[PDB]
């Protein structure tokens, strides 16, 4: 396990600079408008405006965890819960993506985290933008993290009319599809539209699938295809999820092979596909590596791809964000209880399900918890601070014997967390502290 | 089934008047520090503040609410969801509580909905307020929603060491304790605190129980009591919860008799319990009725409590909101798919498991999806408007064959729905349309 990787950062931002002739290190460009040195300064200059302190470890990942937030736990209150946000792990991931595939330039997934440092910093990298709301639009619009319009793609395959209509005129053009009606209305509100038809997927072996929802069948691309033509639509591409959380190296290979066929079906009806995007799916904290998965598909996307006349695009949300927010919650209050002499041990932290815990229902999330300072193992039970009896991160388990004042360290709360998490009983964690693994701002 | 219950209403604010010579229906003076008749201005006065439409139907419930829809469906989109709130239902359930336990003073749990339309009647209706944090405590007292901080109780049995510094500082003093570490904390921070002794009760009929988290056994009140008059805690109740949507009549009997044994193992250590705190549990919606609860307490409290020395308050959340919100989705997109000629019939509506409908998960809830203008039965699926599959409130399930531009009402939606909901892939419903179903102000 390592705290960072300094060696991968360093050729990220030396790739494309005047200290190497501009040159690249692949046959292709760096992700974005902006030059190496512009891009440097860029993401510099988020990381002056978010206060970032350097911290620097070699070091484990969890050994790097457990010192920062002795450190930090001395407008808020000593044992308020909080955030220590790594902004080094987003710019470390961009660069392993760089590295692997420079061939499939990132789009981020906004819904996996919205935090406008990561929006800023991801926006300074390269990376495009995901949205599925009109709200998400407008968040990137609006903070100015585009150069173009062209660089958000509406990756929300059901559209409310009223999305449509303010995508059409903020000037998206790139929208998801994948089904007859979703066709006619693209059409009428959406004139100005470079569709892209998203693909069903053997999904089975994600965290999350999704295919049940979202995913036009292999046999349904026929009318698809029909419709588009009929109802005066810009085919333009082809996408697919394989679900988030997916460690299937053959749930990738085999959506690659199949948006192949797509591309052929598609010049039947008039149209010559330009884009493919392969979506999201892959791990963001380090059995399945990123790299084993990019081993995997930059084969596939040599063979089938590898004429040069299509842009490939990806739409990672977890990757770029899981690793980098460590979640810490004081111990406050505590019972025992007689189970059913055994004792169990009741414990109250704040922070929980009606808040940055709701992943472990709507993400299947298990989350580790460390004991800052680790006592003998009792039968604990865990909970958050709402009244709800149901708001239980822990129920029953062995764990070492903790007191009042101690504190939680819950490393990689980076996606699906706060992202979906509520105010319920009045309660949220709101200190933040930020700080960047990777030596890059003097 | 009935829209409304006006003879209920004008008894209410008849009661204490000068029309009736400041007489009161019962040995018990009305509730709030307002005369009958500042009491009804007050209403009135937040009626004219959210521009409340009075709305009067005999019709029932569903057929007013079928009617109202149809009306309102013609800053927002037209296909936007929205909630039509109907604060006459609120003023009807508090009428209701006055005329079945008026020996019993209300004090609204502030967690199954904060929204200030909903505090501020209830505010100038006589009702206390039950709050669980800082944060709930401020909203209250930052809104001036209470004459004195005597009229908040801080019922949570275990809170953070600045929630107990805040509410010391704010005055507040009636507050919950169930464990012996506790005791210690509200000595040191809440030293002017009149503590309420919370004990368990047989909640396994309840929808939510919550034994499993609060309330101190029987046979651990004996040390609880020691430890108050050992930390110099004044123990001035007994407070209790049967857990949330219980019909179980037999646990509020059984809560209250166990709550009378406290009363008596107070006096040996120093203390004359003037407070009985019932808690909540209590139906909001139109087989176990209010009336049923109401008449099997009634007796119990007279036989055990009819002494005239002790004050009996309870702490309701459902039962004053549940039934006063309507919410109202638009079916904006859907796909066909072949049952593994069978087909299933997927469509998408904008509000869902991320938002208002978490209750399906949080509070075991099971909402009624009507229909607005009901076509033959198809194994239906409806999702909510983000990316996730898992955001589904049907699956496969025989339901009429819907079109795009239809309208689903989901009445009793006013209790843990938007007071937990997050924003995921930001979404929200944010229109409100506020409607009177009582004759009240003119």
Not at 10 to 31: K, M, N, R, T, W
Not at 308 to 313: C, F, K, S
Not at 402 to 407: I, R, S
């Given at each position: 396990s390592v705290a960072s990787s300094?060696?991968?950062?360093?050729?990220?931002?030396?790739?494309?600079?005047?200290?190497?002739?501009?040159?690249?290190?692949?046959?292709?460009?760096?992700?974005?408008?902006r030059t190496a040195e512009e891009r440097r300064a860029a993401?510099?200059?988020?990381?002056?405006?978010?206060?970032?302190?350097?911290?620097?470890?070699?070091?484990?990942?969890?050994?790097?965890?457990?010192?920062?937030?002795?450190?930090?736990?001395?407008?808020?209150?000593?044992?308020?819960?909080?955030?220590?946000?790594?902004?080094?792990?987003?710019?470390?991931?961009?660069?392993?993506?760089?590295?692997?595939?420079?061939?499939?330039?990132?789009?981020?997934?906004?819904?996996?985290?919205?935090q406008p440092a990561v929006l800023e910093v991801l926006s300074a990298l390269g990376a495009g933008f995901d949205c599925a709301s009109k709200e998400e639009i407008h968040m990137v619009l609006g903070r100015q993290?585009?150069?173009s319009p062209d660089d958000i793609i509406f990756a929300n395959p059901c559209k409310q009319l009223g999305?449509?209509?303010?995508?059409?005129?903020?000037?998206?053009?790139?929208?998801?599809?994948?089904?007859?009606?979703?066709?006619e209305k693209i059409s009428r509100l959406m004139p100005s539209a470079h569709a892209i038809i998203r693909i069903k997927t053997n999904d089975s072996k994600a965290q999350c699938s999704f295919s049940t929802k979202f995913g036009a069948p292999l046999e349904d691309v026929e009318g698809l295809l029909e419709a588009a033509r009929q109802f005066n639509v810009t085919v333009c591409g082809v996408s697919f999820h394989v679900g988030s959380g997916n460690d299937d190296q053959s749930a990738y290979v085999s959506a690659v092979r199949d948006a192949y066929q797509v591309f052929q079906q598609a010049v039947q009806y008039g149209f010559k596909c330009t884009i493919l995007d392969i979506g999201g799916g892959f791990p963001g904290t380090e059995n399945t590596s990123f790299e084993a998965i990019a081993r995997t598909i930059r084969p596939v996307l040599a063979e089938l791809?590898?004429?040069?006349?299509?842009?490939?695009?990806?739409?990672?949300?977890?990757?770029?964000?899981?690793?980098?927010?460590?979640?810490?919650?004081?111990?406050?209050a505590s019972r025992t209880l007689r189970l059913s002499e055994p004792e169990e041990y009741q414990y109250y932290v704040n922070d929980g399900l009606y808040?940055?815990?709701?992943?472990?229902?709507?993400?299947?999330?298990?989350?580790?918890?460390?004991?800052?300072?680790?006592?003998?193992?009792?039968?604990?039970?865990?909970?958050?601070?709402?009244?709800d009896s149901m708001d239980c991160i822990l129920k029953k388990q062995p764990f070492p014997e903790?007191?009042?004042?101690?504190?939680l360290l819950v490393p990689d709360m980076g996606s699906y967390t706060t992202a979906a998490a509520g105010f319920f009983n009045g309660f949220a964690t709101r200190r933040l502290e930020w700080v960047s693994s990777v030596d890059l701002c003097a």
């Open positions: 300094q060696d991968l950062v360093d050729l990220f931002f030396l790739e494309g600079s005047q200290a190497v002739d501009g040159l690249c290190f692949s046959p292709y460009p760096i992700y974005g408008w993401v510099c200059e988020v990381f002056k405006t978010y206060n970032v302190v350097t911290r620097l470890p070699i070091e484990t990942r969890e050994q790097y965890w457990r010192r920062l937030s002795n450190l930090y736990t001395q407008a808020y209150e000593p044992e308020d819960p909080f955030y220590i946000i790594d902004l080094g792990r987003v710019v470390e991931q961009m660069a392993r993506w760089r590295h692997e595939l420079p061939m499939v330039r990132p789009y981020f997934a906004v819904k996996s985290n919205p993290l585009v150069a999305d449509l209509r303010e995508a059409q005129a903020c000037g998206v053009t790139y929208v998801t599809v994948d089904n007859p009606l979703e066709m791809f590898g004429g040069g006349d299509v842009t490939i695009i990806s739409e990672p949300g977890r990757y770029f964000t899981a690793a980098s927010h460590a979640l810490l919650m004081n111990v406050f808040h940055s815990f709701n992943c472990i229902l709507f993400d299947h999330a298990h989350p580790t918890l460390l004991l800052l300072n680790d006592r003998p193992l009792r039968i604990t039970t865990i909970f958050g601070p709402t009244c903790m007191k009042l004042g101690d504190w």
